[PDB]
């Protein structure tokens, strides 16, 4: 919704047990809503004190590993679980299945404000780093890189370069920093285009079928495979309203009594994993919140991509 004055590269963050249950219909990498909420929590905890704004996150996923196993004779997968403590009567409690995964990500935070000129870039980058070093990203702790060969320092780069050549070189070197990874972007326009193509293929087709078709492996007879432009994962695109907006005190057992509570339900959209060299500017990968509370549509997305 806004152009950042600088990009804050949080370095390789080792996330221990992230919520691999991204949505009621998808598993694997955590939802972009988790990353946007983590960036908003960074702004709420240290961004205000630095007189800056932290909006926009770039997700690169240098390494992924989910605690999953494949049972013998089945082609699907199951989630490895944890042994919860016993009940008060000494019996095993009912198991609630949750997926927990290991990440290694580096985040590009969009920074705009007066604290960029008020404070040195290295100082605010550092203070954001040790602020994030005691937080959670997707339900998992953050490993702070102690006593390895060398830690990766935080680096903030102002987008207003002295020249176009200097800006282009800075963008390419920042891309070289987060090279063993794949940027995560959203493909709502591609999903709608494929849905229109599917509707011309056969009518009364919903966007759920278009989203399923763009992710499944399709086999066509002469036996070939329908190729995909990219990786094309299905991701939760936000939340849609399910109930009228209640007052902060109406809902029993709320998180607090100062915030209105509205029941919602997941919105499923299209996403893409792509190498960071295939983006014009690294600020095009930033994920933003788009609430629009009048009609629900509590959405997160990455605009200005193409």
């Amino acid at each position: 919704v806004t152009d950042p004055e600088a990009l804050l590269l949080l370095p390789r963050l080792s996330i221990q047990n992230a919520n691999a249950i991204s949505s009621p219909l998808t598993w694997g990498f955590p939802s972009p809503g988790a990353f946007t909420g983590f960036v908003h929590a960074l702004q709420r905890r240290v961004g205000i004190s630095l007189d800056i704004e932290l909006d926009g996150v770039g997700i690169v996923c240098h390494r992924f590993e989910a605690q999953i196993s494949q049972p013998a004779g089945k082609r699907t997968k199951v989630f490895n679980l944890t042994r919860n403590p016993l009940n008060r009567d000494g019996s095993t409690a009912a198991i609630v299945e949750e997926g927990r995964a290991h990440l290694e990500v580096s985040l590009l935070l969009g920074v705009h404000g007066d604290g960029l000129d008020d404070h040195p870039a290295q100082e605010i980058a550092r203070q954001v780093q040790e602020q994030a070093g005691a937080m959670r990203l997707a339900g998992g702790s953050i490993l702070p890189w102690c006593n390895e060969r060398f830690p990766a320092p935080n680096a903030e780069l102002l987008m207003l370069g002295g020249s176009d050549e200097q800006r282009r070189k800075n963008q390419r070197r920042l891309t070289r920093r987060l090279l063993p990874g794949f940027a995560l972007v959203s493909r709502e326009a591609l999903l709608q285009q494929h849905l229109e193509t599917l509707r011309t293929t056969l009518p009364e087709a919903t966007t759920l079928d278009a989203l399923l078709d763009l992710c499944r492996i399709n086999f066509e007879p002469p036996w070939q495979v329908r190729d995909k432009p990219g990786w094309l994962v299905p991701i939760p695109a936000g939340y849609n309203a399910l109930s009228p907006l209640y007052l902060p005190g109406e809902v029993r057992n709320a998180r607090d009594r100062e915030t209105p509570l509205r029941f919602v339900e997941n919105l499923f959209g299209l996403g893409e994993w792509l190498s960071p060299h295939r983006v014009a500017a690294l600020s095009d990968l930033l994920w933003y919140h788009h609430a629009e509370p009048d009609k629900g549509l509590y959405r997160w997305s990455t605009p200005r991509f193409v």
């Binding site: 679980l81 006593n147 057992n253």
Partner: protein
């Protein structure tokens, strides 16, 4: 009236990482940054029926017929190499601040009263005893569990990491420090002071804990076993699956946390077990029995409700237990 909060939650303070397992030789523990990792392998086991019979399978003909069918299983096994006798277990520990602050809570008066209760506790005696017991659980190799059982000598090295380097280093003999007695030692008091300062701070204090256990040359080590539900599939599965992060056997983070939480020696039952993990309703998974039952007035919920609502302050040991539960975390609150 100070009604208790409908939604109550506490963040997990004192959270460790996965205990990476690696192997090497004793008297080379200093140059152990390049020690090769312990790998989880596969092997086949053929056993025989040895469980109790249900008075109908005790016929000799049926027993012999069932023995004549071979019992084959595939298990995950982790071993030290045939030229290495020392198992090195390394993990990272973050001691988070804001220890008494709830993560989610409804009632604002309950917020003020609970924060007042924690303030009274911290300016009365603080985390002196709790961090002492946590530093003891760090100093002895309780997080090795079955790896600590038959080791010739165990040494635990704990380093404080401030920016990127060792601000302060510790070295302990884990077998000398008991698993049930919490004495006082100068280095242990320094570690307890650091942990208490981390708990009372606003940021976090980072510790790496490296334990060397002289298991034996080529012996069998015990990483954490993974919980996988069979879910009634027709194919036979592997009976034992071990945990590994990147081709390297590891121990689960919650397993290490349960090892560190074993500080509760104030439960109403006798301390024949010794310390137990700090949990609501005092549950012990190995003993199958939950001490601190709610029929007695020593469970966490009733103690907290009497302490914060009716201002019935419990004993100092029960206050330590309640604050240790606050360190542990959990999702609380009635409907």
């Amino acid at each position: 009236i100070l009604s208790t909060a409908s939604v109550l939650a506490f963040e997990r303070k004192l959270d460790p990482s996965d205990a990476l397992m690696s192997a090497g030789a004793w008297a080379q523990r200093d140059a152990s940054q390049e020690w090769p990792a312990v790998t989880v392998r596969e092997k086949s086991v053929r056993g025989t029926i040895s469980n109790r019979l249900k008075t109908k399978d005790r016929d000799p003909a049926k027993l012999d017929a069932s023995i004549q069918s071979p019992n084959l299983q595939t298990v995950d096994v982790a071993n030290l190499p045939s030229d290495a006798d020392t198992l090195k277990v390394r993990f990272t520990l973050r001691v988070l601040g804001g220890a008494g602050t709830p993560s989610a809570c409804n009632d604002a008066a309950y917020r003020d009263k609970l924060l007042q209760t924690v303030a009274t506790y911290v300016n009365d005696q603080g985390f002196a005893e709790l961090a002492r017991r946590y530093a003891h659980n760090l100093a002895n190799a309780r997080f090795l569990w079955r790896n600590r059982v038959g080791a010739e000598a165990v040494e635990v090295r704990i380093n404080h990491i401030r920016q990127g380097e060792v601000a302060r280093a510790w070295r302990f003999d884990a077998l000398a420090i008991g698993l049930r007695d919490f004495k006082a030692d100068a280095e242990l008091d320094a570690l307890a002071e650091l942990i208490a300062s981390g708990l009372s701070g606003s940021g976090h204090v980072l510790l790496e804990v490296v334990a060397f256990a002289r298991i034996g040359d080529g012996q069998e080590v015990f990483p954490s076993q993974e919980l996988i539900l069979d879910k009634g599939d027709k194919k036979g599965q592997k009976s034992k699956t071990l945990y590994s992060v990147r081709d390297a056997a590891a121990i689960h983070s919650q397993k290490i946390g349960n090892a560190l939480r074993t500080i509760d020696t104030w439960y109403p039952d006798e301390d024949g077990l010794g310390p137990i993990a700090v949990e609501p309703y005092g549950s012990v998974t190995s003993q199958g029995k939950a001490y601190r039952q709610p029929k007695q007035k020593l469970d966490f919920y009733t103690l907290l409700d009497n302490w914060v609502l009716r201002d019935e302050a419990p004993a100092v040991e029960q206050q330590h237990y309640v604050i240790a539960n606050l360190i542990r975390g959990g999702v609380f609150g009635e409907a």
